[PDB]
Design an enzyme around this catalytic site. Structure first.
Site, PDB file in Angstrom:
ATOM      1  N   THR A   1      -8.387 -13.344 -18.829  1.00 46.25           N
ATOM      2  CA  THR A   1      -8.474 -14.344 -17.728  1.00 46.25           C
ATOM      3  C   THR A   1      -9.499 -15.416 -18.074  1.00 46.25           C
ATOM      4  O   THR A   1     -10.629 -15.102 -18.443  1.00 46.25           O
ATOM      5  CB  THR A   1      -8.863 -13.681 -16.389  1.00 46.25           C
ATOM      6  OG1 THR A   1      -7.841 -12.754 -15.994  1.00 46.25           O
ATOM      7  CG2 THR A   1      -9.060 -14.732 -15.282  1.00 46.25           C
ATOM      8  N   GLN A   2      -9.090 -16.678 -17.961  1.00 47.54           N
ATOM      9  CA  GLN A   2      -9.991 -17.808 -18.170  1.00 47.54           C
ATOM     10  C   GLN A   2      -9.761 -18.864 -17.087  1.00 47.54           C
ATOM     11  O   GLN A   2      -9.069 -18.621 -16.099  1.00 47.54           O
ATOM     12  CB  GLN A   2      -9.795 -18.445 -19.562  1.00 47.54           C
ATOM     13  CG  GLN A   2      -8.997 -17.638 -20.579  1.00 47.54           C
ATOM     14  CD  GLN A   2      -7.498 -17.837 -20.423  1.00 47.54           C
ATOM     15  OE1 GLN A   2      -6.954 -17.689 -19.328  1.00 47.54           O
ATOM     16  NE2 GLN A   2      -6.826 -18.191 -21.518  1.00 47.54           N
TER      17      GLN A   2
ATOM     18  N   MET B   1      -3.119  -9.974 -19.277  1.00 46.64           N
ATOM     19  CA  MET B   1      -4.101 -10.651 -18.417  1.00 46.64           C
ATOM     20  C   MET B   1      -4.968 -11.653 -19.184  1.00 46.64           C
ATOM     21  O   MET B   1      -6.148 -11.827 -18.885  1.00 46.64           O
ATOM     22  CB  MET B   1      -4.971  -9.629 -17.670  1.00 46.64           C
ATOM     23  CG  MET B   1      -4.197  -8.766 -16.688  1.00 46.64           C
ATOM     24  SD  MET B   1      -3.457  -9.723 -15.353  1.00 46.64           S
ATOM     25  CE  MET B   1      -4.901 -10.093 -14.356  1.00 46.64           C
TER      26      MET B   1
END
Ligand code: MG
Ligand code: MG
Ligand code: MG
Ligand code: MG
Ligand code: MG
Lengths: 204, 222, 196, 212, 195, 125, 233, 226, 195, 196
Positions: free
Chosen positions: G1-2, G107
């Site tokens: 996740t970013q 993810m």
């Protein structure tokens, strides 16, 4: 938690040829628990009929309020209120509680005594009027009722045909909703006679 | 925060006849209030006289269908080109879905076809793999608008025979493929009127002993 | 922090302020943000001091091992190694690096690598908290193929303004000149650049 | 959901409702909440439908492998413990299960094990699980005796689901009955609650509050 | 407080209310009477948040007694229940709502009929043959649905009430220390001292 | 400051007369003649425009006023008192009726509201 | 996740009678800062495909390298690499779509919305969409971000359904695209005047147009607009 | 919702779609979104439906009283000022987003109003969930010195873009034209491009299908004489 | 589970454990034996989170039984309690700790002495004359502090235990459905079937 | 938003862009942010459009009532009324206003009122999201007692850069000139200022 789906229940109203019909289930509950099978949600003030779904304390409170207001209306106007006028009264009364509203889904139904025109109307909790020609739906099975009414309904139905349409719309919608059912009532309304029928349905 | 799920709308409907089965679905694909495509096929022929749709999040829907089609192919390799029966396919799909129990395929899956006795069959799945053979099943956005109508018009619920007054139920007479398609079309026409995510086009796949046939119908584009 | 790199006729010049802050406290007022990864490939550092030092040290290692095997690396190659570290470890890095170098074949080149880990080859680049205040000035005043003296004035005037408005920037203006002639360090003090 | 199971002279009665809901929406009225693990063992479904279906079907595979290896019917104790040990490994992961593993063997007699996704494993004579469990318990507790006939016991299980189906909003649809004997379980049919309610009301004289 | 039951039989209304008062860790009392006589032929039992319950009940009692003196006349159970509902309906949108659920058992001397009204803290009124508040109904309603008849005697009603209490004592985790039972009929209100 | 007249200025005399009301009626008597006639398919109201000066533009002074689209008013007596009553009559037709029922009040009820305002000036402090 | 850092805005595209058109502006925004004005977001693959990319630019550059690497890999041990066994738009898309869905399933998504525009071996138009969630769909018109809300309505007035594609010429299609780019320049706060446009035709092949500008803009009416209501001067 | 306003030669025109929704469900398929503030001052509303209705009725009421008080026809700037000061006071809690248009002795006017109280002036405007679809059309086809016929065409085309491309908008197109020195003409259901096709089947039940427990006559009449 | 008591008298150890098993709303069982025999002269009662309690108890039982077979020898209660403590001390820093509190009552055949060990889920061991877990001690310890003597007989210990249970039944809000009592002495482990 | 006000020899000039955004959507591309509170006292508005319009309208009311009683108000007086509203209601306002006016006695004056509600009299002022990018440029290029043509060029070049870098700013460059001669409105279109 959600006030509009604690007690459950539904109301539906339809127009026909020189007639209107309004119907409701009889359930009152505390979420999963069934409490009463005699909680009627349709009231009348003269020849104007009002169905109210939602939080049961508000259903009761608003019925008492519109009885209050239509009684004073009659004394001053020297005539019974009409469906078009009453609809505006319901709207005004709900909007004056804009930032602390009654958690209800009212439905007006009736025939104008002077013009003889069939009239129905619906409202959101805050007073926005939905004046549909065909039908009005309300309650915890409103989606189900929309689906039933949209397919089953056709315009200019005779009173005894309209009864079958609204009854089947209500019954089958309520059977797909956990918080609706436990009996049902249907009002068939004509210009100078009204028939009230209790329907037989599954009690689960 | 990154949200790996999305809602692509759409509505599907499976109905099991006496010697046939239909799986219908609208062709509209959406995100939020925008239309991605007016025609994006949602119901698929997976071979072995089985039709499938995985409605909900389209990426997971496509992934599941792809994996099931792949399962049919490898079932043939491993078991001497044996035909995958609808009940065996259903159990296989349960294991595909439950395999991702803790990161589910965000879809409501329905398959349709014929059982080993030639009778019509429809199976319905929840996102994590619980399933059941059913006669009638709508799935997706307008499922709540369609199912009550089907209870009334297919199973004749709350309908009694005139004169008896609630004493004798309406008899459960068998519906023909032409009669089912009418109910499917009216279900989607009604759903289109009252649900914003439903519209554009209706694609129906009909499964019989002769094979899989397709029928397309226009829906309102607003 | 206010940092920049500018290409010109003879090559490229890297410029930077010398202020490092922990909140409003100036932890170091004479920081050297112009750091060497190869003989004529340098970089300007902005963001997390720990991250950019750790990155620069790794790049210097990579280019040293590169040189041992394949001879002098290009400025593009150096920028690629920076990018690879910054992009692949983007979740755990806060680094904004400008890479500047001089080849004889390619001459002066400038690459900027912002937070994301992307690479952008430019005639000149500005970065750091103080860069925001001089986008207008630098765009209006930059010319290609400037002389050494003109480019030094351009960087001096630019960082002077960046320092003037950005509290996070300050101290001395350090510069490093990269040409065929070699590597020249320059320094300019407050009394010089503030009156500009 | 409402599911029950109780031990008696003639073995075990298992009774369940048939309703499935997603919030207020009634997803189904024809759900099977009795897993036929094998011809001798039954399991009830409550909480997560997939979790119960998957792992009790899986349990049947383990029971089959046991009696192939050991050349002997698996005990209800051993079968229930295979399931409880499995779900206990997954404890914390979010499995949702509340089931009765029911069986009738030579060495044990009629046996019921309540198994839980918290890892709980309880032997007992009467169990009710689900959103309508409290309603079913009332009818059971007041009318239960060990010396019940197979006919009366079947009715008691049917009547107890009906009690819950009426009051509990998330229970209803139909009643499924099973009778577990030493030679295997015997299915005793699907009973629509709508039709059953009026039938019971008239014949029994109960539900006087409801107008029929 | 915990459990309050009500059952309307042929010629009377029977209210059963638990005796326990628990303040978190300890049971401070096991003989608490969770009821107030509003008028000679009208009894109100109550359960809810501490303090609010008794404060509300006594406030209602005072108001009905005031009405009785002013008019020299006893209000009908229906009239009393409507008054109580309005107070609770007024309360729910207040700064700090009364967290009180009540059962109103009364005998209408005009109609010669027993009447049982169930009202929750939101102002949700229902007239019932038998009623409860909280979790009490979950255990008892299946028994009441089965055995109840509108022509039951007072003695039969008490027997059905004993069966309800026995089921509560078996399946409830909380020890409510038994119940105080009171009967409301044409002759007034009396307590069943042995139960 | 403060309105320290919080008591009635109209009171019953020994003979049972309300003096200020009688005197108000005397002021009405001195006022210019106005009339009203009801027909089967309409009503007419009329009055003389008594111009105080020929230099004055009598068109600007409107003795006959629209209260609602279907209701009109004319007067005899003190003009300024009429002008403020028309303003109050127009507002009360909205606040106590149109904003509630979504329609204009019937003649008798608007008259009733105007009458109430005039009654209050006969009893208020 | 970013979270995305340097971003590219709308990519718009449509089918016409002999092929597909795709366009995207040359801006790489840094939040509200219009940082990079020379970013090419249309990346051709061979002479028959153009991949248009919006969203995170660092991920775009990664995808750009994957495609460059894909061409190299396809040429390995492949005598028909420039003929029968050349890369098709459908091959290129399916590869990206696989990667996008795999990455979202770990993810750790490539924070992009991608449109693959091209012409197949048999002359069929290819136009399909894929994004950071791995969601895919095809339509006569496709657009990302703001383009979806403002470009699609305009492009759908030209090609409203499948049957309108053979009736639409390249000149009409290009005109609609160029107009849509102007509308986006008026109304998208993260857009630039400079853009690139690519046409992939089954007859004339790949035509790549760089350094285009939005022109014929209407601003003159702004002089008459004064205040926010009552103000006259 | 899609609502637009377009200025032209001798006046202004506003238009709107006719779909009102409860989340994803269509409540009314032929809703009237064009509201009257005064005879020649009309407005279209988006956002919270009760708020748009209520705020226009309130200002319309006060505008009427003001018109009677001043013996002058009401101005659009007055409606604008009264709306914005009211909405600003409630800090956006009254979710009314309006496009106000009209003609008065000063001339023809077109404004937009947002829920927090900010207002904008323009020759062409659009509001609602389909405003981006509508604005795309307006930006593509609008020009200075439009005729009455051109402005109606443009406005209705902008609404159509919303109807087809925005899921929150649908059904029919309402239009109201306000020209200087003329009565405003309200064109209810100006376009009707979304009529439902005939169903495959009639669902009229046979009489006596529904099971009934009790029947009774309800007394709607008053208490009777004798 | 809820209440577990222990008392070491002259020549034996007495463990009392509640019979109730509650699942939130309902009491699913009222005859549950919350104990396992680890060896012929060592008994362990337990209380804590569901599943963990029995899983832990049986795991310990298996390990002690394994040791008994391997060495043909019964471990002393002290040795068993130390083994149990280490498992719980190992458990508390695990991915998912055992949420289990135990009492270990044993008779040391070598020393001819009864021994009672109290161990909580953290691995906190204490040897005591009498012990409890959870809230049980809050009600009972004042009585045990008063009446307890180290030279008590088994019959006297049971009488003092009845007094503790009576105080629990009076002041605890929860209905724990009575207790199962077991005695551990030189002759082994036996259950007091009437209590 | 990019706004500025600049004093010069003959008086003062207010400048502003015309972009108003709701997120990334341009709600109005031809906004007029230069608004009149008195004949020769105007203001530039930034922040909440609802707040700054509400404030401006109240100020215009106050100065109109001031004029009726005490004659023409000073630019200082106008700034004070703005300040009083912004400062006292700071908890419920998001407003950044530049006040500019022309007296004959005082000539051109500029006051800036940032979020806090403080007042700062300056030779020139810049504000709005786009102002950040032109602090360097404006500081280097501003001179006191410029001519009308020089000041128009200064504002045009400044806002041109602010628009170029700030996505929140754009559209046309509006200007209002305040001198003894009167009030002159100016407008400059994209094709003019972008090529600068
Ligand atoms: Mg039920
Ligand atoms: Mg639409
Ligand atoms: Mg770090
Ligand atoms: Mg500094
Ligand atoms: Mg196992």
């Amino acid at each position: 938690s959600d006030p509009s789906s604690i007690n459950g229940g539904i109301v539906v109203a339809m127009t026909g040829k020189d007639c209107v019909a309004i119907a409701c289930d009889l359930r009152l509950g505390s979420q999963s628990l069934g409490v009463s099978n005699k909680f009627e949600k349709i009231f009348h003030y003269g020849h104007v009929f009002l169905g109210i779904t939602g939080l049961a304390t508000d259903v009761t409170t608003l019925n008492e309020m519109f009885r209050y207001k239509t009684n004073l209306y009659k004394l001053k106007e020297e005539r019974a209120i009409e469906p078009e006028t009453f609809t505006q009264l319901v709207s005004s009364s709900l909007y004056e509680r804009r930032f602390g509203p009654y958690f209800v889904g009212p439905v007006v139904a009736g025939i104008n005594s002077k013009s003889g025109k069939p009239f129905i109307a619906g409202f959101d909790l805050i007073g926005c009027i939905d004046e549909a020609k065909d039908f009005i739906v309300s309650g915890t099975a409103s989606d189900q009722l929309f689906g039933m009414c949209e397919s089953l309904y056709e315009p200019n139905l005779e009173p005894e045909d309209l009864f079958e349409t609204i009854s089947q719309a209500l019954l089958n919608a309520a059977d797909r909703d956990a918080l609706s059912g436990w009996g049902a009532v249907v009002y068939i309304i004509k210009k100078d006679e009204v028939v009230k029928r209790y329907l037989k349905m599954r009690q689960d | 925060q990154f949200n790996p799920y999305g809602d692509n709308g759409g509505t599907i409907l499976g109905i099991a006849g006496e010697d046939f089965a239909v799986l219908a679905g609208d062709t509209r694909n959406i995100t939020d209030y925008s239309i991605n495509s007016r025609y994006e096929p949602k119901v698929f022929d997976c071979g072995d006289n089985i039709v499938m749709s995985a409605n909900g999040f389209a990426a997971d829907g496509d992934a599941l269908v792809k994996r099931f089609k792949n399962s049919v192919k490898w079932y043939h390799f491993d078991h001497n080109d044996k035909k995958l029966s609808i009940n065996s396919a259903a159990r296989n799909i349960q294991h595909l879905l439950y395999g991702k129990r803790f990161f589910p395929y965000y879809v409501h899956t329905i398959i349709a076809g014929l059982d080993e006795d030639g009778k019509g069959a429809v199976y319905s799945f929840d996102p994590v793999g619980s399933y059941e053979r059913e006669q009638c099943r709508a799935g997706g956005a307008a499922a709540s608008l369609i199912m009550p109508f089907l209870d009334n018009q297919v199973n004749f619920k709350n309908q009694y025979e005139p004169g008896t007054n609630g004493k004798v139920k309406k008899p459960l007479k068998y519906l023909s493929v032409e009669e089912v398609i009418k109910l499917v079309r009216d279900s989607f026409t009604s759903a289109t009127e009252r649900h914003i995510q439903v519209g554009d086009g209706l694609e129906i796949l009909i499964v019989t002993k002769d094979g899989v046939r397709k029928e397309f119908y226009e829906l309102k584009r607003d | 922090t206010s940092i920049m790199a500018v290409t010109f006729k003879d090559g490229v010049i890297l410029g930077a302020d010398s202020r490092t802050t922990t909140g409003a406290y100036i932890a170091n007022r004479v920081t050297d943000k112009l750091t060497r990864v190869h003989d004529k490939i340098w970089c300007c550092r902005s963001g997390s001091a720990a991250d950019t030092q750790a990155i620069a040290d790794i790049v210097q290692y990579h280019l040293e091992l590169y040189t041992s095997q394949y001879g002098t690396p290009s400025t593009e190659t150096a920028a690629s190694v920076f990018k690879e570290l910054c992009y692949e470890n983007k979740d755990n890095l806060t680094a904004g690096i400008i890479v500047a170098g001089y080849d004889d074949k390619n001459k002066g080149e400038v690459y900027t690598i912002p937070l994301g880990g992307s690479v952008h080859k430019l005639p000149y680049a500005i970065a750091g908290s103080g860069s925001t205040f001089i986008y207008g000035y630098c765009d209006k005043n930059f010319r290609e193929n400037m002389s050494k003296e003109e480019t030094v004035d351009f960087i001096k005037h630019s960082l002077s303004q960046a320092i003037k408005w950005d509290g996070s920037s300050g101290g001395v203006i350090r510069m490093v000149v990269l040409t065929a002639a070699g590597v020249e360090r320059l320094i300019f003090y407050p009394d010089e650049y503030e009156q500009l | 959901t409402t599911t029950l199971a109780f031990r008696f002279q003639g073995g075990i009665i298992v009774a369940v409702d048939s309703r499935a809901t997603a919030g207020n929406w009634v997803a189904s009225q024809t759900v099977k909440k009795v897993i036929e693990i094998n011809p001798f063992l039954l399991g009830t479904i409550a909480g997560g439908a997939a979790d119960c279906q998957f792992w009790e079907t899986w349990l049947g595979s383990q029971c089959r492998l046991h009696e192939l290896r050991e050349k002997e019917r698996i005990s209800v104790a051993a079968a229930s413990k295979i399931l409880s040990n499995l779900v206990y490994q997954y404890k914390g992961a979010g499995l949702s299960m509340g089931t009765m593993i029911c069986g009738y063997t030579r060495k044990e007699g009629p046996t019921i094990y309540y198994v839980d996704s918290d890892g709980t494993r309880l032997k007992g004579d009467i169990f009710c699980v689900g959103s309508g469990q409290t309603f079913a318990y009332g009818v059971l507790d007041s009318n239960y005796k060990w010396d019940l006939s197979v006919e009366d016991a079947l009715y008691l299980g049917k009547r107890s689901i009906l009690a819950a189906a009426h009051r509990d909003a998330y229970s209803g649809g139909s009643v499924n009955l099973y009778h577990v004997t030493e030679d295997g379980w015997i299915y005793h049919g699907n009973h629509d609650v709508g039709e059953l309610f009026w039938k019971v009301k008239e014949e029994e004289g109960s539900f006087n509050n409801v107008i029929g | 407080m915990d459990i309050i039951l009500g059952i309307r039989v042929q010629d009377s209304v029977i209210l059963a209310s638990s005796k326990a008062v628990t303040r978190g860790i300890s049971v401070l009392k096991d003989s608490d009477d969770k009821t107030r006589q509003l008028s000679p032929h009208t009894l109100m039992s109550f359960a809810g948040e501490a303090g609010d319950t008794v404060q509300f009940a006594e406030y209602i009692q005072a108001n009905i007694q005031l009405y009785s003196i002013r008019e020299d006349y006893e209000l009908s159970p229906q009239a009393v229940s409507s008054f109580v509902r309005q107070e609770l309906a007024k309360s729910i949108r207040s700064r700090r709502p009364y967290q009180v659920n009540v059962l109103i058992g009364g005998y209408d001397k005009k109609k010669n009929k027993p009447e049982l009204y169930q009202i929750d803290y939101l102002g949700t009124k229902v007239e019932l043959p038998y009623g409860a508040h909280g979790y009490s109904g979950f255990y008892t309603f299946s028994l009441l649905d089965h055995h109840y008849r509108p022509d039951m005697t007072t003695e039969e009603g008490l027997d059905l009430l004993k069966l309800c209490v026995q089921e509560l004592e078996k399946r409830m985790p909380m020890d409510f220390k038994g119940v105080i039972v009171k009967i409301v009929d044409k002759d007034g209100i009396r307590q069943v001292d042995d139960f | 400051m403060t309105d320290r007249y919080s008591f009635s200025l109209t009171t019953f005399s020994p003979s049972g007369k309300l003096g200020q009301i009688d005197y108000a009626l005397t002021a009405v008597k001195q006022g210019v003649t106005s009339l009203g006639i009801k027909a089967t398919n309409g009503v007419v109201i009329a009055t003389e425009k008594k111009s105080s000066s020929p230099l004055a533009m009598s068109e600007t002074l409107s003795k006959v006023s629209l209260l609602t689209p279907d209701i009109g008013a004319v007067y005899s007596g003190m003009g300024p008192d009429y002008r403020v009553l028309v303003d109050k009559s127009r507002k009360v037709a909205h606040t106590s009726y149109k904003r509630i029922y979504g329609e204009y009040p019937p003649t008798k009820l608007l008259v009733s509201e105007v009458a109430k305002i005039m009654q209050e000036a006969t009893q208020s402090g | 996740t970013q979270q995305p850092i340097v971003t590219g805005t709308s990519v718009i595209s449509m089918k016409y009678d002999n092929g597909v058109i795709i366009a995207a502006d040359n801006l790489g925004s840094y939040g509200s800062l219009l940082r990079f004005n020379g970013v090419e977001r249309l990346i051709p693959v061979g002479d028959n495909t153009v991949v248009g990319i919006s969203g995170d630019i660092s991920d775009m550059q990664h995808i750009e390298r994957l495609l460059k690497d894909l061409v190299t890999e396809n040429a390995y041990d492949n005598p028909l690499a420039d003929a029968e066994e050349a890369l098709e738009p459908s091959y290129i898309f399916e590869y990206l779509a696989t990667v996008m869905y795999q990455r979202r399933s770990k993810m750790n998504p490539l924070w992009n919305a991608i449109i693959v525009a091209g012409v197949q071996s048999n002359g069929d138009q290819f136009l399909r969409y894929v994004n950071l969630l791995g969601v895919t769909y095809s339509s006569p018109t496709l657009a990302t971000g703001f383009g979806a809300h403002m470009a699609n309505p305009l492009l759908r007035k030209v090609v409203d359904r499948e049957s309108d594609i053979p009736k639409t010429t390249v000149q009409v299609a290009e005109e609609a695209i160029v107009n849509a780019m102007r509308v986006l320049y008026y109304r998208d706060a993260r857009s630039s005047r400079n853009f690139s446009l690519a046409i992939i035709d089954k007859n004339t092949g790949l035509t790549f147009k760089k350094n285009l500008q939005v022109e014929n803009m209407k601003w003159d009416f702004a002089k008459d607009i004064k205040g926010y209501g009552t103000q006259k001067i | 919702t899609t609502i637009v306003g377009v200025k032209f030669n001798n006046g202004v025109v506003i238009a709107a779609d006719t779909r009102s929704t409860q989340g994803p469900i269509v409540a009314d398929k032929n809703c009237a979104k064009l509201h009257r503030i005064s005879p020649k001052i009309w407005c279209a509303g988006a956002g919270t439906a009760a708020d748009t209705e209520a705020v226009t009725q309130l200002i319309g009421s006060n505008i009427e009283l003001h018109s009677l008080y001043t013996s002058r026809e009401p101005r659009v700037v007055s409606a604008l000022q009264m709306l914005k000061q009211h909405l600003f006071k409630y800090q956006g809690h009254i979710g009314a987003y309006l496009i106000v248009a009209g003609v008065d002795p000063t001339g023809s006017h077109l404004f937009s109003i947002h829920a927090h109280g900010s207002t904008d002036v323009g020759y062409y405007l659009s509001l609602g969930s389909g405003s981006l679809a509508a604005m795309a059309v307006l930006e593509s086809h609008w020009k200075q010195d439009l005729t009455k016929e051109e402005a109606i065409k443009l406005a209705s085309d902008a609404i159509q873009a919303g109807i087809w491309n925005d899921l929150g908008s649908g059904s029919n197109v309402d239009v109201c034209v306000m020209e200087i020195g003329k009565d405003a003409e309200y064109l209810r259901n100006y376009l009707t491009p979304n009529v439902r096709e005939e169903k495959q089947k009639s669902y009229k039940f046979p009489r006596g299908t529904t099971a009934v427990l009790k029947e009774s006559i309800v007394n709607i009449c008053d208490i009777q004489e004798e």
